[PDB]
Design a protein around this ligand. Sequence first.
Ligand SMILES: *[C@@H]1O[C@H](CO)[C@@H](O)[C@H](O)[C@H]1NC(C)=O
Lengths: 50, 43
Amino acid sequence: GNYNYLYRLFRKSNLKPFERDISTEIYQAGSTPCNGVEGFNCYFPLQSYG
Amino acid sequence: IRGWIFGTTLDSKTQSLLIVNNATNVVIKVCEFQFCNDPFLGV
Ligand SMILES: *[C@@H]1O[C@H](CO)[C@@H](O)[C@H](O)[C@H]1NC(C)=O
């Protein structure tokens, strides 16, 4: 299984044309602030292709 | 005046544009810069 290729799975808004976003900030999917700490409702925005 | 810096957070975890005129050539980069509180040059 090759996991070197990634794709962003969450983002607060859609990308504008030809916009590139490489930030790895933890996406807060809930009402609880993550403060850079992963956990419940606090996900890494990138995910590997299988 | 020598340059401009553009971005959203103007710090790391994201990219930010930097344009700087040295003395004979303008350098433009988009690295994930960690800018200082009061950035400036040391001429
Ligand atoms: C650009 O960054 C700002 C920073 O808060 C954000 O509000 C805005 O949604 C971002 N632009 C896009 C297209 O997501």
